Design a protein around this ligand. Sequence first.
Ligand SMILES: Nc1ccn([C@H]2C[C@H](O)[C@@H](COP(=O)(O)OP(=O)(O)OP(=O)(O)O)O2)c(=O)n1
Ligand SMILES: [Ca+2]
Ligand SMILES: [Ca+2]
Ligand SMILES: [Ca+2]
Lengths: 974, 411, 399
Amino acid sequence: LRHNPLDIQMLSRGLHEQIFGQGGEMPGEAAVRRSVEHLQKHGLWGQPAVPLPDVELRLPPLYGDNLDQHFRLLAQKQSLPYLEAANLLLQAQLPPKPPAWAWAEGWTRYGPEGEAVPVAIPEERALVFDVEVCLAEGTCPTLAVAISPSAWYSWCSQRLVEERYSWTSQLSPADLIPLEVPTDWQEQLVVGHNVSFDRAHIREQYLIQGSRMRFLDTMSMHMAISGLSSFQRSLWIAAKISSWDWLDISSVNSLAEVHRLYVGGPPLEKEPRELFVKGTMKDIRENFQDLMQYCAQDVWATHEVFQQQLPLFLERCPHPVTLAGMLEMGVSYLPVNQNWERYLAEAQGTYEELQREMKKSLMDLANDACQLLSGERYKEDPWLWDLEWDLQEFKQKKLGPCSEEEEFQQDVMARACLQKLKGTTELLPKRPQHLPGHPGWYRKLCPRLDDPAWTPGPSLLSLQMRVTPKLMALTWDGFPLHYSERHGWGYLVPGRRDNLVVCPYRAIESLYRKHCLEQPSYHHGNGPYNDVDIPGCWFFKLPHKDGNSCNVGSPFAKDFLPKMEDGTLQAGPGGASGPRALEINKMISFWRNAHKRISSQMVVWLPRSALPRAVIRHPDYDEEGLYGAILPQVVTAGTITRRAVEPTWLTASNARPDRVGSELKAMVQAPPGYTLVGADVDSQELWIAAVLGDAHFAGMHGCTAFGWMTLQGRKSRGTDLHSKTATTVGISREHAKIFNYGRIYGAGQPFAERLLMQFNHRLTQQEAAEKAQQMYAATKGLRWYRLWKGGTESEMFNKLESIATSDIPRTPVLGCCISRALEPSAVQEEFMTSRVNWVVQSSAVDYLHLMLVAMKWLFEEFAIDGRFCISIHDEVRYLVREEDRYRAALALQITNLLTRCMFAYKLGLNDLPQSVAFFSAVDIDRCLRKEVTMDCKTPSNPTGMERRYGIPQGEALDIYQIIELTKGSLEKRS
Amino acid sequence: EGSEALLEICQRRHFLSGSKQQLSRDSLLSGCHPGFGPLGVELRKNLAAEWWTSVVVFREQVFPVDALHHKPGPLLPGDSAFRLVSAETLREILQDKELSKEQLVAFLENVLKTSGKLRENLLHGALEHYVNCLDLVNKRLPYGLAQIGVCFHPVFGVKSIGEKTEASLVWFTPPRTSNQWLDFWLRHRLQWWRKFAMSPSNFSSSDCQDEEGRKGNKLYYNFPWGKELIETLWNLGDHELLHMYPGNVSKLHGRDGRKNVVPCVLSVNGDLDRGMLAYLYDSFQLFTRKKNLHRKVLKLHPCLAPIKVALDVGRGPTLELRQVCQGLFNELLENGISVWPGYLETMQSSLEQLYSKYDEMSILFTVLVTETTLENGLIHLRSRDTTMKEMMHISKLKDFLIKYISSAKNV
Amino acid sequence: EALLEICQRRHFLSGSKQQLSRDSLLSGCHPGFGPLGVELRKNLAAEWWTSVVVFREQVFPVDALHHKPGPLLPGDSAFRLVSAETLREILQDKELSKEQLVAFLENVLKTSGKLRENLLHGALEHYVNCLDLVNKRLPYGLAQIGVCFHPVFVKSIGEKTEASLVWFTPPRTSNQWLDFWLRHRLQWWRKFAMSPSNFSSSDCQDEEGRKGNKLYYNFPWGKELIETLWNLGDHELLHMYPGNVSKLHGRDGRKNVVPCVLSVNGDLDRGMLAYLYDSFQHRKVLKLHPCLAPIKVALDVGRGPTLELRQVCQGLFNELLENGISVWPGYLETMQSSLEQLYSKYDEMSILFTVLVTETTLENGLIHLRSRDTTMKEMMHISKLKDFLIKYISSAKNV
DNA sequence: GTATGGCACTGGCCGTCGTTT
DNA sequence: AAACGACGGCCAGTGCCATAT
Ligand SMILES: Nc1ccn([C@H]2C[C@H](O)[C@@H](COP(=O)(O)OP(=O)(O)OP(=O)(O)O)O2)c(=O)n1
Ligand SMILES: [Ca+2]
Ligand SMILES: [Ca+2]
Ligand SMILES: [Ca+2]
């Protein structure tokens, strides 16, 4: 068993005969013949490839008959204590609220008859917990309320009970909320709505070594059970196309709406005077009781919704894997050091500096424009001709000798004459003129001279003003810009005649020559509007991403960042010119928007006493440094897919040489003695789709053309999906990747048409339709017998549509059911694209859950001194102690194998190709970056990561290298 | 090639010196040119003042230092460097049979071990002073010594000497922070060069490593022909300091926190003549709408421009105009503004040529006193940036100018 | 002398006890000056420049190179550069050696350069081109402050930083300008002195040129020259430009005239030493003039919380420096000694004012102040101090 | 495959009205 | 009593987020 009937290398004999069954089964010959016919019709049959080296491992013993039972047992073992806690909380009989809340120092517990007693911590297996933070003083918690199945607890910080005008801004564990018990059973569960926010304020969540406490979020459970899509959310808000029966069983993620849906009854009462979001500490000190009552009400609502949701979730996701996956996904962790702060500072500085330069440049342009007044030269400039070039009149009303001594008299006489002249203030009108002689347009940018805010030059000029694009002399495909009233900013085509000021009739044309010779309108674009009647020229709107009839208020918007090639969209001048300003704008675009989120991140710095001994006595530890952590507020299920969501960290952005502040990922640095061991799954979703199609078709790997190309394709030769499509249709690799991912999720032809019209504006629509039709016919194929078949991904789409159309759609691997808001009964053949996207992305979520469970099991069994760090998109990273860096790597590889094997097992396939058996490479590094070799050069970090901070290059190991480094064993005794 | 027109203009307005034939790019780069004209000297003075303000005054542990232009005493033979000898002794040596057969060839060795040399860099004197200056800060290790001076370099009768004025800062640090400090200065200095630049992107930096493995950075300006070095930063460790003071190591110690250690040395050396030339090139022009408004002007920064305002007169009662111009000139100078006394000139050309001349000289503003001024004290003011005239009352002129300059320091 | 040892202790002079001596300081072969000495010299140079150059329409800066290449006059007293590269070629072939090596000395004159003996020649070299700057208006001058090298008698090199003004005048008014400049220079030297009576002038005669004047300062051992004015005339300019004399003509009274040249050269090192001696005449204190003093005010901390007094001192330090006032960051030092020793140290350094911050500054905003010239203690609010300081200096400049 | 609402931010137009003279 | 400069109010477009505080 080394090659399947289709001459595709499979898993090695030693691994196959210990992961799967030795007996097993083999496909019939008819299916093999059908697959051969398919492949040879597509033209791939005769393409043998050199085999890879074989691999043999003594895999750790499994449990049960097969892989499914093994994973079930592992997940159940992981999740048992937390299900025990959840069940204990589900049966709770909550006593009444205390008659009067206490004004105390820390945690206090309230028993029968309202008695209050101070305690160190709740000391409960389960809790429902809510916190309130006053934004007026920063991010330190103010007060919180918790409920156990037996009593009420309340907590408040010293920043409320005691009053003083000085508190350190740098956060420390000494001010956070203590929950964990010292060293009744070790495992603990905390429930809440948006529980990540509450976790961020826990004292013991910032320790380097993980803890057995876990957090279950009500919002994630709601999203899983009865969540809504973005379009569905918009329509739901609009109400509170053809079928509306899904409204009564779904709602937005707000706590009030959730309680209204699951629990019902009297609505929840807010506080109209938002003393936390807009009040002050004095307001809280005055309105203590009411705020505590509101918090208790919110906690009670959260407990009720949890009671009503837990059985529903346990029913719609039976497989134990999902619960453990969420539990492990809810404990993210990002270490950082003092460098983080530096980064922020530096980035901010750079930002400001660039802005100044840009501003300066614009001012220079303004000055250079004034000269155009002479000889009415401005009247020939094809940009500034229409400005207010008016000059006002000024106003009125009401032989050498040698010096002798005592020349001081002459100086005194001159000074007296000057003083005599200084007093001639009676004639001047008191109401002064403002810079007469200067053009009015220039004067608008000049501050009043007498004001205390005066600055020299046109310091008021700035981006977003209609003047700025005119001054830069910007062009679009070499056509100058222009502003009108039937649109925002557009461009001017100079090829017009028949009287469509004389400047535009002859002066503008020359510009096009300088671009045409450097490489009824004949040019095609948005469309002319004769309402604008500039002689001898056509006006064309700048294509707005929302389609025609929309006005573009600025040519420097986000969607215009692609801009054009270096041969256009620029002006000839150099220093303080349009090109440099555009470059500066492109550089600062990212930071301009992300700076608030990035700087607002909450950071807690661990004291020395809290550090593990491995860090204190490490040779690479400095006593003067700072070590802290960020606990991202990612919600385990922020989308109906159950995919995790967070705006800051879970992003596709990475360090770039052209964007300022892009090295944020690189600032997550492991402490001394620790490393970030991780890997990126090789083409996760595409492989999932390929295996789905292959299992649907003939039960053999690679039986479909899509699966073949997925296995036998390589990026290094351009035979992978992205490169092949790019070379067949003629676009960039990234654009082809976007197109392919869009098509995979069920996007139709019109989406492709619009996207490929966006990618290059030159392409006409009547040919964009042809492009989309040809491409989809090649990929998708014809629908039915008359009026999918014949396509490379026909069977994959058939299976996806079939599973989406089922009565109760479920993930083919773990079986989690789709949200009630998308059931065919409720939607009645609506939102089909949403279901098609959901099936694939939820399969990816199941893959992630399987990875997490396997990694946790392997770490626990072999005492690997590590911890899960983060997972972003399809890449995963773990914080592992240095000495075990290699062992963990092997574990990761093992995980991959099992995971893929699992994905093959549930679809009825008893083999796994050797190509996808292991990670292409495993990364070992002390920082987060796409590759361990790049130095992360950015304008804010010009010297590189290695020069400034001292992070060396990492390692990218293979399966064989790890095997030789570890001898293929995870035991410490090796 | 604008390199010709720019240099012709620079010579004409007395930024440079010497005849037209003598001046050339190679001579300017090498440092063997005749020198700089008064405007060039003023520009260099402004640049030096800005550098000193940015580097020395604002810091608690940077002190001035003076290094002699020559180092006497014996040295290592074989350097082939020029030697200093007085012509008064160039005949008494050989008189009356002093080994005059063949030892005169070996007399070269005496030349290698009897006369001093002209210092080639300011680092050596600062290293000499290190020990004595250590008392200024009670041995607090992080501290600097700065100096602006002139250095001499051989260049290729056969070979000549070029003189270059350079600013040097030697910064002694704890070894552990050394690298960090490097980066710090690498930023600061670079930003300084970007501060006054019209095109700060033309100033660039690169990283380099010594054959001994030590780190450093090179700062370049992009002249129309290529990149030219203008400043260097080097991390030197304790090698030079240890050699210069052999024997007891402890005497080099200084305090870092509570640790006595021998400092690491960081040397920053920039060339002020090359910096001035780069700034002159940057301020020059070096497309469609430019075909008409081809004004030739040097847009030097207000903080660097040698002359701020120029004074002239209109035709009328000469004595009164002269008196008021004298008073205004005294007032402007008293407040720290540099004025070009153009009211002393007898001219034979229109205002256009006057404006062109003042633009090539980089005059920020031109003030004109006219007959009507005597009635109400309103003078004409023309700005270099805008070239637009305004009427302004005398009683406030001074203040406004100061304001302008003040803003230029911060904005 | 006690003054010399105090200057050595307070980083005015540079070197060691034996290296520093009267003769070495006067002749210019001293090891160098300390940072305070450099600051004092820079202040003196700035005062000289503003007095001479800033407030005059006919004085311009000039850039003279420290050496003059090309063949020179043979057999004179001045330093010359021995061939540099020639030291590498001779070591592989001998030109018969023996008594033709005397001609080697002549070959030195064929190629050897020369260091700058004085700034007069460099300025004279620029006369023709600098004449255009004033539209040939005959009266104009060139000023420059620069270092010069002198033989000292084995010979030694003495470095002297000197300020030189070359003044071109009509021959008809040369004497009037000469005595005018004499008066102005004498007044400038008297201006900063605590006892101007110790500055004197004399008139001197020469075979060539015309009369001149010498300025002397009375050091404790005798009068010493510090500056000279000479009416050189026209011989040097004519010699430097033989041939068509018309190129040397300036305009005076609508007629062409060959200018007469006067030279005013003053030694700034000697002047700095003279001022140091002057400002030292029952406590050892240097009462340097406020304009010339290198450091104006010194800051310090008092008893109380460190991380608040330190921030107050940092703010005051930044505020004082932003306005051009030099400051001694004494707040960085620990309370190692008593207050009296700190006062004495600042008195020797010539610190104008001493600032003491205390916890009472935090409680009320008051700061203790001590004045160098009076020794009386005062209390002032922080927000005022800056302005007050400027006023003080301003008064000293106007008085 | 359709997209609603609200909040923060900046720029441009406006008709009304006190101030100057 | 006539012209003007200044200004709270209104409109439009952009960016961020459907949640906690
Ligand atoms: N239009 C897209 C493209 C990607 N993704 C997601 C899926 C994965 O989470 C990740 C994949 O991105 P890569 O850049 O890592 O993708 P490949 O692995 O397909 O790219 P390559 O072949 O360039 O390595 O982003 C998405 O949601 N929509
Ligand atoms: Ca909450
Ligand atoms: Ca609440
Ligand atoms: Ca990838």
